[PDB]
Design a protein around this ligand. Structure first.
Ligand SMILES: C[C@@H]1O[C@@H](O[C@H]2C[C@@H](O)[C@]3(CO)[C@H]4[C@H](O)C[C@]5(C)[C@@H](C6=CC(=O)OC6)CC[C@]5(O)[C@@H]4CC[C@]3(O)C2)[C@H](O)[C@H](O)[C@H]1O
Ligand SMILES: [Mg+2]
Lengths: 31, 264, 992
């Protein structure tokens, strides 16, 4: 069934890296 | 209001938008270069096929007066167009047609998705397969259709998944198609290939257009007879199979919903 | 109206003590009757300034919607508040698009207001809890009885008795006065006390010594006079009304703002209607081609710009409250650097308004004291014996004493009980020689002759503390001529010596030199009496000559004046280095005026007045070509008959000017006359006679501590510590925040081009909607909100103090040159990046570009549930839509990726990003947040519905990359060219 995406894992995989810059930038502002 | 420098602006943009347009096209041409002729690079968007309807329903509704001839010329026109394609005259010579099994046969992958052979053969389909669909005024004929899907291999439900009541059990090669709306104010009839109320697994997988021009997809005549004529009725066709799903937002995912009213 | 107040006043001080009594029907030794008193009271009114019309209300919020910008937001959010209703009558489709957008802009207006209303609220309270003025009681004579009453009860006719310490209850005509001085630093702005005598002096009610003016305060001595003017009827009173009753005017920064709109709206209707005709010619009924025209507004009007600018200004002003510079207005923050000519008060402003020991002539040598508040200078000398014999005299022949309970406040700030000169001495000795009370205790005073009007001198007789030669010591001080007239010897280096006619000349050199510097001079001398003619218990006769008054030992001179501020001079210099014209406007006398002028650098070395030349070549006045006089000085008496064309001409041909002895109203005309040139002029005064000048000034600036109330009121700025040097810091910040405002408008407006076009071609090539509305609002206020603000914190791409003030009429804030970069150049590359990502998402999903022409029709058809791609596959309604909306989302991401680029090329104007590096720490964090936000607005469980934002595939993000990097380059290169060729068709065309 090559008609399928693992969207569930890129959603879980983007939401993990947009929450990392959200905190990286909190490291550089609050320095 | 500046003068003599106008030519300085004109010449600038000319060969700036000029090159900007160059680059925008440049790239466009390259990303045109990594997609098949034969197959869409992504299809996860059409995962659940969508059951479309021939009578072009302004808002999913077919209200019209039996007493007027022109009160349903609109529903006649479009049902005409869809059907002028399936002419026995359009498809005469085995090139590029093939008189498939007069009934629900089995699918046959015609090679792969290459232009290494000719134009993939295309199974026929007789307008005759759709009995009693004048068209009649009493009880307009409404044919259903399945949305085209490259590589789609519909797999009808196993004999273990079936409720009250999609019959018969054509497990072999046929996609059942029941209709409903409680509220049972109808009488359902289905004019099929073999006569069955389902699609023949002899027409899949559909091989693109670029690979099978003039291809033709199955049809499924379904018109009612004994119905009310002074109220709108809410009926819903629905397809069934492992490869068949429905959503809450799309009221067309493997199903319709028609508001017919034969007022007069 | 006010025109009556632009002219000199009249008076009647030229009336005999009798007449003045016959006109007011009052008594000179009795004062009128309590009955005649309450009467003449209800006739006119109470003695006070009418309640200042300063009673605002919640309705004030409206004032925050007057701003041209605020208008658009309203005109738009209302105009886009109607699009919903226009369609709605038909079909409710776009109800989150138009309807929402309106509410959004709506609330925007509302908050933006708050940051504008919370400003002029916090500033007030922060300035309302200051030193509150509490009117005291006056001393009047009614029925021969003297009493004290509410100052409001003083009527035109009663006798008033003033003393040393209180202030003038109302306008007076002296009829009795004993050694009476006063402070006219509210009319003339002249601190040095002004004697008051019942005898008329000058014909001008502003020079007469028989008139005390309200709002002033009797420095010393006593006196009595009749009240001729009460309440607003007072000389200074009328000025208050004209001050708080004057017009505000339009600020400079506001000018740029209003002008900026004209350009925005200017294209927004050109495109709006240009595309309405285009739409018609493209087969579009009269119900559409207009429903589009209304369209091209949002795209064309920055929704977040307003809240941006405002946040910027607020911020910059917060960075000034940190340097002790406060403001009441938000627009003011800018004016200080758009300034081209500063008008300044002398007393209280450039100076400290406090007599202070300036110079001394001891040991046949001119010494100089430190004159700053915080004694930043250096000591002169303390070794020589003469100094001690001088220090003793100033400390002992002296009656001034420090008010009780002040051992906390610095010496120079503690109040003193005494007159001008003697306070100075007291403080000067107390500073560099310890406690003076220590000297008046060790050396007990036995008999003294207080300073006589005839004597012209003051002497004392003290018990020597030395256990060796503790013999009667005589000390006197007074006019330098009277002291030298009673001298035989001159203590030089300790030992006495003959009063040679050599030293009777080197004293005549100093006394005329220090005097020429507009300084008051005092001569000092002492004598060690002959202990033979004076025993241990000798009684001295202060009334008769019991001791020696002639042939004394001259010790030295000391001079004193109204010293300037701490850094006042250094400051003024700064502004001149910047190309700002400094102009002194004081109501003082030319003599001292011109003096402080050369001392602060308003008048530099080597420059001369038409008069200076006249003196040098010893020629007449009307024989020196006025053009050779780069400087000049103008007495208010000469201005009285001067036509504006003349003042005009005076300001044109001179560089260093000093208008002296000017009336408040002249300040006004001076300012006006400078503005008549087209310049941006700032007024900095303290005395109430400055209001009418400071309120008419593009921006006024007051002296916090020493400044009077009404100047504070009519003022636009408040120096809380009076630190002039903040001014420089002020214009710097003003000039810095100016450019960085540009850079932010740039960044923002560039974002606009890739927001419009998607809706334009949509109508031209009939392709599905590339960019949705809910999307735009996630840029103009989502990701394009942080970056912008961050631009506030760019530094200077050069030394800006090193450049002339902008020409307000020429160098606009949003000029056409900046338009043709964000719109006609960068936005364009930002647009193409937008569409590239577009065709990508569709193509990979089975709809080639070519096939995409004219699809919209069927595409947006909500019936066709089987539209055919270029692969022959068939799509329902919702399915293809999920792609449209997922084609919205990346256009949104993609934009962000080009706002990476824009944000950096905009951080600068001419300097390469390598040159200016990446010092800005905020601008940095913005990229991360601007990004993290987009990312979040995508992979959010539900956003796919709340904002029709769908997730993006790996290969998606990198769609803009090749473009974003193009931008970066195109600009870095362009700027390198601007640097190499500072002409130019590169700079004067593209250089913002
Ligand atoms: C061709 C056209 O396509 C569909 O409508 C289109 C025009 C119009 O209807 C609207 C809604 O009113 C427009 C509206 O007008 C202008 C917008 C405010 C515009 C903005 C400009 C800006 O600056 O920010 C936002 C971008 C999208 C927008 O928010 C909506 C989006 C939904 C849409 O529906 C789209 C319908 O099918 C219609 O019937 C048919 O005429
Ligand atoms: Mg003053």
């Amino acid at each position: 069934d090559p008609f399928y995406y693992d969207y569930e894992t890129v959603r879980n995989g983007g939401l993990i890296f947009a929450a990392l810059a959200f905190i990286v930038g909190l490291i550089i502002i609050l320095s | 209001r500046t003068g003599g420098s106008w030519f300085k602006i004109l010449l600038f943009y000319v060969i700036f938008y000029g090159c900007l347009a160059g680059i925008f096209i440049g790239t466009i041409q390259v990303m045109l270069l990594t997609i098949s002729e034969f197959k869409p690079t992504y299809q996860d968007r059409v995962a659940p096929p969508g059951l479309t309807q021939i009578p072009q329903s302004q808002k999913t509704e077919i209200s019209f007066r039996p007493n007027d001839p022109q009160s349903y010329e609109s529903y006649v026109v479009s049902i005409v167009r869809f059907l002028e394609k399936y002419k026995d005259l359009a498809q005469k010579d085995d090139m590029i047609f093939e008189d498939c099994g007069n009934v629900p046969s089995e699918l046959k992958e015609r090679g792969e998705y290459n232009n290494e052979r000719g134009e993939r053969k295309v199974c026929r389909f007789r307008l005759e397969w759709l009995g009693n669909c004048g068209y009649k005024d009493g009880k307009p004929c409404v044919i259903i259709k399945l949305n085209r899907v490259l590589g789609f291999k519909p797999k009808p439900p196993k004999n273990e998944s079936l409720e009250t009541y999609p019959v018969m059990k054509y497990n072999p090669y046929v996609l059942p198609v029941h209709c409903t709306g409680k509220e049972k104010v109808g009488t359902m009839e289905y004019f099929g290939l073999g006569g069955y109320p389902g699609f023949p697994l002899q027409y899949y997988p559909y091989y693109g257009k670029l690979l099978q021009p003039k291809y033709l997809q199955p049809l499924m005549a379904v018109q009612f007879t004994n119905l009310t004529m002074d109220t709108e009725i809410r009926i819903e066709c629905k397809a069934y199979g492992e490869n068949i799903g429905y959503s809450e937002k799309d009221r067309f995912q493997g199903r319709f919903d028609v508001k017919i009213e034969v007022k007069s | 109206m006010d025109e009556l107040k632009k002219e000199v006043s009249m008076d009647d001080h030229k009336l005999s003590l009798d007449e003045l009594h016959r006109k007011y029907g009052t008594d000179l030794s009795r004062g009128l009757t309590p009955a005649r008193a309450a009467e003449i009271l209800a006739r006119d009114g109470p003695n006070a300034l009418t309640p200042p019309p300063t009673t605002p209300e919640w309705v004030k919020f409206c004032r925050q919607l007057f701003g041209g910008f605020s208008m658009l937001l309203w005109i738009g959010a209302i105009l886009c508040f109607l699009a919903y209703g226009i369609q709605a009558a038909t079909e409710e489709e776009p109800q989150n698009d138009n309807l929402y957008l309106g509410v959004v802009l709506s609330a925007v207006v509302i908050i933006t207001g708050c940051f504008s209303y919370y400003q002029e609220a916090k500033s007030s309270k922060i300035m309302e809890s200051f030193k509150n003025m509490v009117p005291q009681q006056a001393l009047v004579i009614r029925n021969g009885e003297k009493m004290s009453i509410n100052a409001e009860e003083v009527v035109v006719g009663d006798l008033v008795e003033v003393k040393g310490g209180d202030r003038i209850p109302a306008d007076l005509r002296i009829i009795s006065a004993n050694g009476c001085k006063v402070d006219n630093s509210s009319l003339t702005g002249e601190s040095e006390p002004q004697t008051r005598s019942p005898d008329f002096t000058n014909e001008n009610p502003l020079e007469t010594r028989n008139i005390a003016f309200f709002s002033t305060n009797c420095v010393e001595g006593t006196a009595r006079g009749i009240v001729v003017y009460t309440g607003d009827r007072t000389v200074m009173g009328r000025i208050a009304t004209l001050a708080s009753g004057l017009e505000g005017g339009q600020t400079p920064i506001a000018a740029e703002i209003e002008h900026f709109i004209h350009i925005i709206t200017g294209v927004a209707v050109f495109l709006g209607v240009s595309f309405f005709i285009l739409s018609l010619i493209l087969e579009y009924t009269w119900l559409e081609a207009v429903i589009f025209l209304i369209g091209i507004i949002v795209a064309n009007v920055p929704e977040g710009l307003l809240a941006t600018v405002t946040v910027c200004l607020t911020l910059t002003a917060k960075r000034m409250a940190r340097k002790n510079c406060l403001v009441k207005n938000l627009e003011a923050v800018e004016t200080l650097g758009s300034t081209s000519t500063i008008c300044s008060d002398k007393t209280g402003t450039l100076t400290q308004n406090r007599m202070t020991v300036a110079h001394m002539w001891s040991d046949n040598q001119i010494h100089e004291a430190d004159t700053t508040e915080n004694q930043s200078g250096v000591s002169f000398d303390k070794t020589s014996a003469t100094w001690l014999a001088l220090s003793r005299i100033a400390g002992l022949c002296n009656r001034a004493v420090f008010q009780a309970n002040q051992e906390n406040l610095p010496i120079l700030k503690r109040a003193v009980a005494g007159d001008a000169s003697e306070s100075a001495l007291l403080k000067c000795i107390e500073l560099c020689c310890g406690s003076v009370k220590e000297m008046r205790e060790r050396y007990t005073k036995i008999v003294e002759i207080p300073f006589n009007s005839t004597n012209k001198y003051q002497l004392s007789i003290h018990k020597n503390p030395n256990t060796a030669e503790p013999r009667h010591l005589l000390v006197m001080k007074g006019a330098p001529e009277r002291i030298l007239d009673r001298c035989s010897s001159i203590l030089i280096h300790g030992k006495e010596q003959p009063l040679d006619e050599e030293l009777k000349d080197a004293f005549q050199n100093a006394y005329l030199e220090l005097g020429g510097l507009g300084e008051r001079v005092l001569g000092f001398c002492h004598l060690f009496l002959p202990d033979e003619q004076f025993p241990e218990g000798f009684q001295f006769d202060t009334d008769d000559v019991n001791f020696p008054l002639d042939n004394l030992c001259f010790v030295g001179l000391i001079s004193m004046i109204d010293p300037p501020r701490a850094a006042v001079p250094d400051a003024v210099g700064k502004c001149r280095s910047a190309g700002i014209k400094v102009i002194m406007v004081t109501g003082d006398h030319p003599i001292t005026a011109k003096a402080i002028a050369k001392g602060v650098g308003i008048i530099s070395e080597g420059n001369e007045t038409v008069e200076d030349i006249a003196a040098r070549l010893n020629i007449p006045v009307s024989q020196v070509n006025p053009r050779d006089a780069k400087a000049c000085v103008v007495h208010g008496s000469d201005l009285k008959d001067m036509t504006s064309e003349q003042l005009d001409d005076i300001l044109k041909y001179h560089t260093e000017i000093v208008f002296a002895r000017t009336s408040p109203q002249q300040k006004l005309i001076i300012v006006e006359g400078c503005q008549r040139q087209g310049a941006i002029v700032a007024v900095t005064g303290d005395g109430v006679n400055d209001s009418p000048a400071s309120k008419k000034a593009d921006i006024g600036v007051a002296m916090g501590i020493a400044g009077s109330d009404v100047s504070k009121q009519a003022a636009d700025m408040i120096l809380l510590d009076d630190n002039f040097a903040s001014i420089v810091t002020g214009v710097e910040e003003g000039r810095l925040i100016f450019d960085n405002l540009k850079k932010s408008i740039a960044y923002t407006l560039t974002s606009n081009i890739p927001e419009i076009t998607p809706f334009l071609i949509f109508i031209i090539a009939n392709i599905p909607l590339p960019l949705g509305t809910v999307t735009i609002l996630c840029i103009d206020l989502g990701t394009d909100m942080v970056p912008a603000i961050s631009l506030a914190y760019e530094q200077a791409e050069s030394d800006i103090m090193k450049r002339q003030p902008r020409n307000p009429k020429t160098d606009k804030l949003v000029n056409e040159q900046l338009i043709s970069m964000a719109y006609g150049q960068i936005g364009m590359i930002q647009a193409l990046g937008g569409f590239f990502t577009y065709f990508v998402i569709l193509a990979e999903n089975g709809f080639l570009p070519i096939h995409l022409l004219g699809l919209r029709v069927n595409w947006d058809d909500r019936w066709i549930n089987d539209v055919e791609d270029s692969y022959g596959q068939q799509w329902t309604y919702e399915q293809r839509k999920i792609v449209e909306f997922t084609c919205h989302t990346p256009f949104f991401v993609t934009i962000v990726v080009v706002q990476w680029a824009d944000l950096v090329i905009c951080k600068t104007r001419r300097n390469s990003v390598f040159q200016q590096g990446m010092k800005n720490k905020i601008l940095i964090f913005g990229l991360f947040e601007e990004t993290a936000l987009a990312a979040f607005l995508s992979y959010c469980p539900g956003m796919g519905v709340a904002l029709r934002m769908y997730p993006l595939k790996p290969t998606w993000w990198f769609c803009a990359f090749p473009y974003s990097l193009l931008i970066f380059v195109y600009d870095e290169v362009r700027k390198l060219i601007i640097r190499r060729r500072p002409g130019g068709w590169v700079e004067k065309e593209t250089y913002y």
